[PDB]
Amino acid sequence: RREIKIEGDLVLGGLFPINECGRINEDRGIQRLEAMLFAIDEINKDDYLLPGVKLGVHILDTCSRDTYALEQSLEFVRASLTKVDDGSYAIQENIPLLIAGVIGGSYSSVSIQVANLLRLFQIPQISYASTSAKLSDKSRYDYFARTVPPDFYQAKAMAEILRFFNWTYVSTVASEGDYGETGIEAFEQEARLRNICIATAEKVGRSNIRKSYDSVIRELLQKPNARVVVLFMRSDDSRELIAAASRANASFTWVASDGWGAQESIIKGSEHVAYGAITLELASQPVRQFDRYFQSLNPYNNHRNPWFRDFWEQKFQCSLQNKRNHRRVCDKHLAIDSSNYEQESKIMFVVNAVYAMAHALHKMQRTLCPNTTKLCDAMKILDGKKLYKDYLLKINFTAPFNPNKDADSIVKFDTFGDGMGRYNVFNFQNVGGKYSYLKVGHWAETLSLDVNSIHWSRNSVPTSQCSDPCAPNEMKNMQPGDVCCWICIPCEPYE
Amino acid sequence: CSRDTYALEQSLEFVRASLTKVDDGSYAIQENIPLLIAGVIGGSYSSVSIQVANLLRLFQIPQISYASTSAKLSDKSRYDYFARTVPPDFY
Numbered sequence: 332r333r334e335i336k337i338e339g340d341l342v343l344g345g346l347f348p349i350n351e352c353g354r355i356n357e358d359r360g361i362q363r364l365e366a367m368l369f370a371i372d373e374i375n376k377d378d379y380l381l382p383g384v385k386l387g388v389h390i391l392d393t394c395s396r397d398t399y400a401l402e403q404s405l406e407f408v409r410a411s412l413t414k415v416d417d418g419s420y421a422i423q424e425n426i427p428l429l430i431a432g433v434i435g436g437s438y439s440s441v442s443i444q445v446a447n448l449l450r451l452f453q454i455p456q457i458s459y460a461s462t463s464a465k466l467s468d469k470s471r472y473d474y475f476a477r478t479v480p481p482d483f484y485q486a487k488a489m490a491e492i493l494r495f496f497n498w499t500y501v502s503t504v505a506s507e508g509d510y511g512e513t514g515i516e517a518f519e520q521e522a523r524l525r526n527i528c529i530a531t532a533e534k535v536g537r538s539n540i541r542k543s544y545d546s547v548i549r550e551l552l553q554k555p556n557a558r559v560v561v562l563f564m565r566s567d568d569s570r571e572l573i574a575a576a577s578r579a580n581a582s583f584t585w586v587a588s589d590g591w592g593a594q595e596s597i598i599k600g601s602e603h604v605a606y607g608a609i610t611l612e613l614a615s616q617p618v619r620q621f622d623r624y625f626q627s628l629n630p631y632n633n634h635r636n637p638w639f640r641d642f643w644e645q646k647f648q649c650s651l652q653n654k655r656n657h658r659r660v661c662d663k664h665l666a667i668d669s670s671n672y673e674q675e676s677k678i679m680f681v682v683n684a685v686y687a688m689a690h691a692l693h694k695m696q697r698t699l700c701p702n703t704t705k706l707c708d709a710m711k712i713l714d715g716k717k718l719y720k721d722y723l724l725k726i727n728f729t730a731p732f733n734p735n736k737d738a739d740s741i742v743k744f745d746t747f748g749d750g751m752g753r754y755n756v757f758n759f760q761n762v763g764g765k766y767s768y769l770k771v772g773h774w775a776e777t778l779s780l781d782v783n784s785i786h787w788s789r790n791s792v793p794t795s796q797c798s799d800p801c802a803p804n805e806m807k808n809m810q811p812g813d814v815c816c817w818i819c820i821p822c823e824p825y826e
Numbered sequence: 827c828s829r830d831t832y833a834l835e836q837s838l839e840f841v842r843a844s845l846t847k848v849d850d851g852s853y854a855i856q857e858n859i860p861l862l863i864a865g866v867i868g869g870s871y872s873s874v875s876i877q878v879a880n881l882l883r884l885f886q887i888p889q890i891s892y893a894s895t896s897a898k899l900s901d902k903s904r905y906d907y908f909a910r911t912v913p914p915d916f917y
């Protein structure tokens with residue numbers, strides 16, 4: 332098992348989808364991990380926020396799998412269990428560092444398992460990308476918080492997106508799991524609220540053979556009238572479904588979600604099959620300081636990561652001197668600046684999370700041990716319950732880069748420990764052949780799309796809507812075998 | 827102690843064996859090695875049974891109550907590995 336363990340006065344837990352158990356995640360995982368460690372270094376180098384407290388880290392692979400993430404969550408937990416616990420001469424083995432607070436994120440299912448295992452140890456947990464509405468509940472997940480808004484706000488944004496184009500008749504597909512099911516249920520409720528019908532609902536499983544996805548594709552083609560499919564999937568399932576839909580001679584205008592996000596590697600090599608896609612993302616503002624820090628990184632100056640070598644040899648497809656015969660050997664001048672490095676949108680969220688935790692600790696330090704800037708007897712024992720309930724949940728500090736224009740500088744949690752609901756909408760339009768996303772609008776509660784800048788798939792507004800609003804006042808509506816939508820029959824003038 | 831927190835600590839005492847094997851002394855590290863529990867009989871007060879069931883769910887260790895009649899434990903979602911020879915409370 333590969334880990335990161337940097338010791339200090341206090342240590343934060345690190346949960347990321349570094350691997351996909353499979354292959355290394357290139358954007359979601361490693362950029363977020365580097366950002367977290369960068370913020371940790373900034374904390375351990377500054378002088379106004381925990382100056383005398385050196386903040387360490389313990390970061391572990393999740394593989395986007397419940398059982399595996401649970402095993403490294405148990406690795407986090409071992410520290411509190413070993414406290415009550417001998418040896419003939421000296422028994423060290425591994426010394427599990429006492430985690431002050433776990434910055435645990437990635438998908439919703441992993442975060443829910445981590446919250447379940449950490450609630451029993453009253454260890455605070457801050458997420459950065461998990462957005463399931465289930466985690467808003469405090470009955471089972473009281474000690475869970477996150478700087479991202481819950482799922483049902485995103486579902487409401489999706490329903491508004493649908494009703495802006497009058498897409499009354501749409502299909503939808505979600506990933507079989509807690510996140511996909513919960514979010515798609517919320518979005519379907521919003522759709523029935525806005526009188527926006529649905530065609531089909533399909534589930535593919537968090538991990539499945541390439542038999543479910545093509546069946547879902549055939550189901551989506553079983554209703555040609557519905558040119559719009561609402562996709563609410565996790566990132567890996569989105570990748571698999573896009574690959575499957577490209578396998579068949581098919582295309583659509585995919586209404587995507589946060590799991591799709593502004594991700595490029597998900598659609599890698601498959602621009603056409605998802606060209607008119609509409610994707611929502613939790614709006615943010617990237618950090619230039621992290622940009623320069625991350626670009627300054629090299630495998631020679633980065634021994635802090637067990638994966639950075641494999642990350643480099645995957646992203647650039649060139650092997651180091653380890654083998655030198657698989658594909659190629661990296662030149663000595665390889666870099667990141669001009670290369671295809673678009674830092675993930677959800678980086679600053681990650682960073683904010685850590686700082687929130689840091690500030691909480693700072694406030695707790697200013698309360699438990701205000702006489703000195705030390706981890707004295709009052710503070711050397713972590714009061715996770717009190718830390719979470721009195722410092723974490725109530726944290727009101729300006730954004731780390733309020734010098735940059737940010738009306739939403741205040742990181743203010745709701746009563747349930749969630750962030751502001753403020754989203755960006757993207758379409759995968761063409762710019763230069765190797766085209767990418769760019770912002771087509773923003774949303775707080777009222778849409779701000781721009782139809783002109785959409786540049787749709789079939790060079791035209793998708794008319795995924797079914798026949799017409801039947802207007803029974805002049806022609807009544809009937810559903811012979813078409814339960815979804817209606818067909819009009821001109822009512823008699825004498826009836 | 828008919829308490830959630832104290833029974834939770836002894837539940838940890840149950841649990842602080844699984845993480846031991848996966849975890850190197852100078853000569854030996856063995857004072858009182860806890861044993862992995864094939865199955866836990868834990869019951870009486872409902873809150874205690876719920877907390878112990880939450881802890882055991884993460885370890886697929888079956889837990890059988892003997893008196894906790896709470897219908898909340900009837901929920902097999904978060905109390906999957908739970909069982910009880912006592913009927914639920916709605917009766």
Ligand SMILES: *[C@@H]1O[C@H](CO)[C@@H](O[C@@H]2O[C@H](CO)[C@@H](O)[C@H](O)[C@H]2NC(C)=O)[C@H](O)[C@H]1NC(C)=O
Binds near residue numbers: 495496497
């Ligand atoms: C969605 O449907 C509504 C009405 O059902 C459209 O609203 C009208 O559209 C006509 C042209 O089709 C305009 O002349 C009117 O100004 C609109 N009136 C009202 C009260 O809305 C709406 O345009 C449709 N949205 C899109 C993108 O086509």
